[PDB]
Enzyme design. Structure first.
Site, PDB file in Angstrom:
ATOM      1  N   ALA A  61     -39.015  31.841 -14.816  1.00  0.00           N
ATOM      2  CA  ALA A  61     -39.408  31.380 -13.500  1.00  0.00           C
ATOM      3  C   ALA A  61     -40.435  30.279 -13.699  1.00  0.00           C
ATOM      4  CB  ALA A  61     -39.947  32.526 -12.657  1.00  0.00           C
ATOM      5  N   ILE A  62     -39.942  29.046 -13.676  1.00  0.00           N
ATOM      6  CA  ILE A  62     -40.715  27.842 -14.023  1.00  0.00           C
ATOM      7  C   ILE A  62     -40.879  27.014 -12.765  1.00  0.00           C
ATOM      8  CG2 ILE A  62     -40.774  25.776 -15.517  1.00  0.00           C
ATOM      9  CD1 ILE A  62     -40.722  28.457 -17.044  1.00  0.00           C
ATOM     10  N   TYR A  65     -39.493  27.813  -9.090  1.00  0.00           N
ATOM     11  CA  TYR A  65     -38.664  29.022  -9.210  1.00  0.00           C
ATOM     12  C   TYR A  65     -39.483  30.297  -9.194  1.00  0.00           C
ATOM     13  CZ  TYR A  65     -34.410  26.343 -10.068  1.00  0.00           C
ATOM     14  OH  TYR A  65     -33.309  25.531  -9.911  1.00  0.00           O
ATOM     15  N   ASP A 143     -30.748  34.795 -14.397  1.00  0.00           N
ATOM     16  CA  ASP A 143     -31.554  33.795 -13.681  1.00  0.00           C
ATOM     17  C   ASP A 143     -32.250  34.421 -12.480  1.00  0.00           C
ATOM     18  OD1 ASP A 143     -30.876  31.847 -15.531  1.00  0.00           O
ATOM     19  OD2 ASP A 143     -29.440  30.874 -14.201  1.00  0.00           O
ATOM     20  N   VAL A 144     -33.327  33.760 -12.066  1.00  0.00           N
ATOM     21  CA  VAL A 144     -34.271  34.325 -11.097  1.00  0.00           C
ATOM     22  C   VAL A 144     -33.861  34.066  -9.646  1.00  0.00           C
ATOM     23  CG1 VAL A 144     -35.907  32.360 -10.861  1.00  0.00           C
ATOM     24  CG2 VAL A 144     -36.716  34.763 -10.670  1.00  0.00           C
ATOM     25  N   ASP A 145     -33.099  32.996  -9.414  1.00  0.00           N
ATOM     26  CA  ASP A 145     -32.732  32.589  -8.067  1.00  0.00           C
ATOM     27  C   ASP A 145     -31.524  33.382  -7.577  1.00  0.00           C
ATOM     28  OD1 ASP A 145     -31.311  31.090 -10.073  1.00  0.00           O
ATOM     29  OD2 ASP A 145     -30.994  29.444  -8.688  1.00  0.00           O
ATOM     30  N   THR A 177     -14.535  24.346 -17.229  1.00  0.00           N
ATOM     31  CA  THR A 177     -15.444  23.232 -17.544  1.00  0.00           C
ATOM     32  C   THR A 177     -16.166  23.440 -18.870  1.00  0.00           C
ATOM     33  OG1 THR A 177     -17.171  24.233 -16.156  1.00  0.00           O
ATOM     34  CG2 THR A 177     -15.769  22.605 -15.146  1.00  0.00           C
ATOM     35  N   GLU A 235     -24.845  27.061 -21.087  1.00  0.00           N
ATOM     36  CA  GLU A 235     -23.609  27.713 -20.683  1.00  0.00           C
ATOM     37  C   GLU A 235     -22.429  27.246 -21.516  1.00  0.00           C
ATOM     38  OE1 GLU A 235     -21.393  27.000 -16.674  1.00  0.00           O
ATOM     39  OE2 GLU A 235     -22.498  28.882 -16.507  1.00  0.00           O
ATOM     40  N   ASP A 258     -21.462  34.244  -5.417  1.00  0.00           N
ATOM     41  CA  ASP A 258     -22.115  33.339  -4.474  1.00  0.00           C
ATOM     42  C   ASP A 258     -21.327  33.478  -3.195  1.00  0.00           C
ATOM     43  OD1 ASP A 258     -23.050  31.213  -2.913  1.00  0.00           O
ATOM     44  OD2 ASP A 258     -23.314  29.930  -4.674  1.00  0.00           O
TER      45      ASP A 258
END
Length: 277
Positions: A61-62, A65, A143-145, A177, A235, A258
């Site tokens: 968490a930077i 974030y 991830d934090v979000d 991708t 990734e 999502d």
């Protein structure tokens, strides 16, 4: 050494009835693909509690974030490994901005101050190697979000897991991708690939996660020296690693969803861990 399970009463598994007929539930290398309906959580909880399993959960968490920590941690308390030992490791540049979140018994949080693209892989493999080995049995890296909305438990635990990216689980491999330039260590040609794994949710035993993160970090440094940055950064490297070192479980997109972008398809019986809108 594993002690015996106690007597348990539950529905008999029926050999001539699949749990789920609408999805692939095992990979071609015999790793389970974890969907709702495939596991009896009571059996799994017994197995893991009898080993007194401790799960580490890492999050970075930077800068801005840090704002996402409160909902991330509060919803983790409701849904992540409840009943088991949990150690949260919050890596941040702003220790004083970490919210004071009330934790259940057997759960702890450590704040680790950091000083960009390689940070995550480097921190998990180099800076924190010895600590994780002494403190936890499994590491889960997210991830934090994000927020937990439903059960995420010991059904995910295994030596090495990746998660199906929610945008690509129905895609052909040519549409994935992956990094496509042969000059990158992350290169995967058009005729290779099992799945497109999400960088935001991976894990395993401490040993396997440190192996993965070390390999990805080394590959990223090779690319940097060669003046190339993989299309999707760590990734892309995670995908190359999991192509050549098959995960022992694969999490379905229930585990990284999502809803704003993708809705709630019938194939998803639960939306467990989701992007914040």
């Amino acid at each position: 050494f594993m002690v015996s399970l106690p007597r348990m009463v539950y529905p008999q598994p029926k050999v001539l009835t699949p749990c789920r007929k609408d999805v692939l539930v095992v990979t071609p290398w015999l790793a389970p693909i974890v969907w709702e309906g495939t596991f009896n959580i009571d059996i799994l909880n017994e197995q893991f509690r009898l080993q007194n399993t401790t799960i580490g959960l890492t999050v970075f968490a930077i800068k801005k974030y840090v704002a996402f920590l409160k909902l991330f941690l509060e919803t983790a308390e409701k849904h992540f490994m409840v009943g088991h030992r949990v150690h949260y490791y919050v890596f941040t540049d702003q220790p004083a901005a970490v919210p004071r979140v009330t934790l259940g018994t057997g759960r702890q949080l450590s704040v680790l101050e950091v000083g960009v693209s390689m940070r995550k892989m480097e921190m998990i493999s180099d800076f924190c190697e010895r600590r994780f080995l002494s403190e936890v049995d499994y590491l889960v890296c997210v991830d934090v979000d994000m927020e937990f909305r439903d059960h995420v438990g010991v059904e995910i635990l295994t030596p090495l897991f990746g998660t199906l990216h929610p945008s690509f689980y129905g895609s052909s491999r040519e549409a994935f991708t992956y990094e496509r330039r042969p000059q990158s260590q992350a290169y995967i040609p058009k005729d290779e690939g099992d799945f497109y794994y999400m960088g935001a949710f991976f894990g395993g035993s401490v040993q396997e996660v440190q192996r993965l993160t070390r390999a990805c970090h080394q590959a990223m440094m090779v690319d940097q020296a060669n003046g190339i940055e993989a299309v999707w950064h760590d990734e892309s490297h995670l995908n190359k690693y999991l192509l050549r070192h098959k995960p022992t479980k694969v999490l379905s997109p229930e585990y990284l969803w999502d809803q704003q972008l993708l809705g709630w398809p019938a194939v998803l019986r639960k939306l467990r861990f989701t992007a914040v809108p």
